[PDB]
Amino acid sequence: ENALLRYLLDKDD
Amino acid sequence: SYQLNAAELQALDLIQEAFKGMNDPMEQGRQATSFLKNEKSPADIMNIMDVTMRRFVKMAKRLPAFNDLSQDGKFALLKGGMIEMLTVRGVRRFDSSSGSWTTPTLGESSEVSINMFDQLNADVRSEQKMRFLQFFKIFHEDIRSNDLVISMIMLIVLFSPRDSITDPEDRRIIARHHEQFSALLNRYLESLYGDDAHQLNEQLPTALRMLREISASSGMLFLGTVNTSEAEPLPREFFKVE
Numbered sequence: 221e222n223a224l225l226r227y228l229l230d231k232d233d
Numbered sequence: 234s235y236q237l238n239a240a241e242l243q244a245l246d247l248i249q250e251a252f253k254g255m256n257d258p259m260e261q262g263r264q265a266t267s268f269l270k271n272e273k274s275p276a277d278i279m280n281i282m283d284v285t286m287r288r289f290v291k292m293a294k295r296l297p298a299f300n301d302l303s304q305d306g307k308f309a310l311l312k313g314g315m316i317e318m319l320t321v322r323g324v325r326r327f328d329s330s331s332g333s334w335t336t337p338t339l340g341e342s343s344e345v346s347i348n349m350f351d352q353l354n355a356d357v358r359s360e361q362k363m364r365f366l367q368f369f370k371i372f373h374e375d376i377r378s379n380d381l382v383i384s385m386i387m388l389i390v391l392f393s394p395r396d397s398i399t400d401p402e403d404r405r406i407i408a409r410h411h412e413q414f415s416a417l418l419n420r421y422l423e424s425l426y427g428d429d430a431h432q433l434n435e436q437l438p439t440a441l442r443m444l445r446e447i448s449a450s451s452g453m454l455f456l457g458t459v460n461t462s463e464a465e466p467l468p469r470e471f472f473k474v475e
């Protein structure tokens with residue numbers, strides 16, 4: 221379910 | 234008349250700011266090792282794509298237009314647009330004479346050959362190789378090498394309507410920015426080339442439709458070519474390997 225894309229989108233860079 | 238005004242110049246500065254990081258050096262690690270490897274496997278190609286994909290996520294989050302969307306909207310756009318954006322990066326980084334892609338921080342010695350396609354899914358690889366070369370060929374030499382043009386094309390691709398997006402406000406924002414960045418690209422090109430820009434503007438729809446075709450036909454390219462334990466997970470969300 222594209223978990224890693226979502227995680228990267230939602231993280232604080 | 235054709236010269237850019239302050240508002241247009243500001244919009245371009247904001248874009249360049251968001252893309253800061255895209256051309257930065259790679260840290261030592263799995264991805265950098267794969268890029269420097271003389272003999273690359275399909276897993277190495279996935280490792281390389283991981284770098285650019287992550288950088289796209291970071292860029293988008295630096296753009297005010299993007300941050301007007303809901304979190305689900307943001308996700309839907311990145312999911313729908315990633316392969317097209319990668320392909321546009323591909324056009325920026327490709328050299329027809331050497332037949333290879335390079336990265337801006339590293340000498341032209343390190344590269345990925347167009348013949349990487351020949352190790353991918355035999356059912357579709359030859360057709361995808363042809364599609365990429367066909368797409369590359371439409372671009373004028375000085376247009377494909379212009380970072381602002383490429384950046385704007387990437388943003389027009391990103392802010393494209395998706396049936397996956399149901400939220401009325403997200404849909405409004407996406408349509409608005411699709412037109413905004415399209416208009417800005419045209420104005421930018423007019424500021425450089427005047428009336429000669431009209432011909433380039435007329436080609437924008439051709440580029441977008443060809444990009445969509447590439448994205449719609451690339452999903453199985455890595456099927457059966459990679460050991461998951463050797464390939465970054467992010468690209469595997471876009472390219473099914475099993």
Ligand SMILES: C[C@H](CCC[C@H](C)C(=O)O)[C@H]1CC[C@H]2C3=CC[C@H]4CC(=O)CC[C@]4(C)[C@H]3CC[C@]12C
Nearest residue numbers: 284285319320322323326334335336337345361451
């Ligand atoms: C732009 C990139 C090389 C530079 C990477 C480096 C980290 C950077 O962004 O500076 C190349 C390497 C592999 C290429 C593709 C693999 C799959 C194929 C699959 C296709 O059929 C479309 C083209 C696509 C996505 C190209 C695009 C350009 C890529 C990402």
